[PDB]
């Protein structure tokens, strides 16, 4: 019961004062929670480039959770996805935003996230009916979150015409391929589209919005809630006077845009947006020089971690696991903090796409993958790379 | 299926005459034959944990139960119809290379591996292959340097007895068989002695039907599946317990075999009345030349030459020339080593088996490469919510009740 009765200092009504040094019990896990519905996108997200399905989704949306191992001993993750996401970019960007088939099921497009909204019982749980929009994140050089500044008055309109954004994450939220059927309505107003259907669903419930993301991710979710508080769009398009509200956790934020970008969040009355931040790790840096932070700032050191090898790299102080992980455990930054788990998250974890723990936890590095792949036998006697369940994406009857 | 082609033909197919009329060119029942007992060796690499961060390295991961639905010898296998009665271990007294016995970084065995297994056909399988099946398949080797099978002969007089005390075998091939660890309850048991007990209680219970014997195995495994052949014949092995005057045929199918034994292990073998062999061997494939200088060969060979497949890369490597299933393609479409034959699949062997353990396949067959692994490799979450390396089934390998 008690995440029902704090939720909205959980999602930060009071800009998490006194929940932070030191970390709050039940904000520790509410964090964990809304991680791993970001990681839950790279548990699905193909990374196979000698696949046909590369950049695209491995799981369905139908029973997603349980898929990616977020039903067992996860009584309060009770969300059914409702649809998937895709994005695509006008702009040459990185392979770790996105990915393709090395010939495949699209040139110019991955999978880029999710909406998802919580049944009867997770609306019980968690004390409000919350739909999460899930936005996936980097996959495996700190000169990939290069870019100058782009105008973004095509979000935020010409009443904030000096409003500047990255110009990576804009093009990813922003750009179409008109020749696909993923990818002609761009990653933005998917996501628009599908949480005004939920919030008019719901138009007589309390409602939440939260947003969730890791690296790429985190910048992809800080612009969405900015945009969806900024225009408007947390409101039921039947009941413009309610309105609901939009907080994001993010993971390893890269930065998003400058001084006029952070003018304008700070006067957004119904966001809220926590950055939990690993001292050691070099992206939330990026970009050095040029652009501002938004929201409020939860530092941890996964150095103090005894489980962790020592020393860390790039990929090992900005995986999420590992960020999920120092949340789990931590008891603060200064050196006479010592780190201690208090939850029960398994350390394996971790490893899914790193070598991350010290050898003697006796877990294999980089474990996360399909059996075989994904070859499978056919009943045939035949053998087929099966790495990707049909999902039309249609919207579902609600 | 329903003229019982395979049972009808058996004996032939096992090489009662040498194979003669059946090679050049390749006859379609033993195309299909040579493939079946490949499979059988091959499976001893898919269950292989080769996971050096596992403290299970170096075992099984499957149980006897169910095994050969365990590495995809069911769906489109009818003839596969056979119960794993025991494991095999093996240790060795000398140091041998990682891809001949492989160990746990930090475990569950310090000195000792899994190192195939022996099955036998249940009553249907009886039935299918037209005789009571008794297989022994020798795991082979695993992921490269052709020095790895550079050894030198060692005096063979604990196997084939002073009345063959010439014979001299590989040193590597006879530390894996006859190497002993007191400590162990795996190896206080060499291999080839737990082969021979377990043989021998089959063919103990079998008694009063027809009966044979077919090892395989591939590289390592190829070697050890000759050596274990000639001394299950030479030791009169290959005879139940209460019935000495009963022999029973011993076949070898062995692919990509390295050399076992000098001039009077040759010698030993022509002599042996029951036994045969048959070497695939695939050209490019320098393997089967190892050791070059002191050896012999044994058995009648069936060349292959999987450069001539269109769908391999090319240019192939020492692993992609030497892999078990690039072997098994090869079988299922050659068509002669000739220039002018045309390779061909005469058998619906899915391409993508290639790909197991090697990035073998042109990129345009659209599979990927070095494929086999579990899921998660192993990690599983558990009922509580932990989550653990889970690499390994429970199996005792106590004697089965028969």
Redesign the interface.
Known sequence: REFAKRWRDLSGQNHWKGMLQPLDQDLREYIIHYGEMAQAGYDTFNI?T???FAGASIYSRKDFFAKV?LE???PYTKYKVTKFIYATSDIHVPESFLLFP??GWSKESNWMGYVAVTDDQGTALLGRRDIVVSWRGSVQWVEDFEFGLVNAIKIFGERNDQVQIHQGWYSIYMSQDERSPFTKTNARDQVLREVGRLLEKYKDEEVSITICGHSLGAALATLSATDIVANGYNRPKSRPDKSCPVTAFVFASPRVGDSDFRKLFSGLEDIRVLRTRNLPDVIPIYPPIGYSEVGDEFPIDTRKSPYMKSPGNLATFHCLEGYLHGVAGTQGTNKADLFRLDV?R?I??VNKSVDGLK?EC????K?????????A?????????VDHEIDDNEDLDF
């Open positions: 196979n000698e696949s046909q191992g067992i001993a996860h090395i010939s029960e398994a394996g974890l050898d006796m877990v294999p590095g474990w996360r993958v399909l059996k075989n792949k994904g070859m036998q056919q009943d045939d006697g035949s053998w087929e790379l």
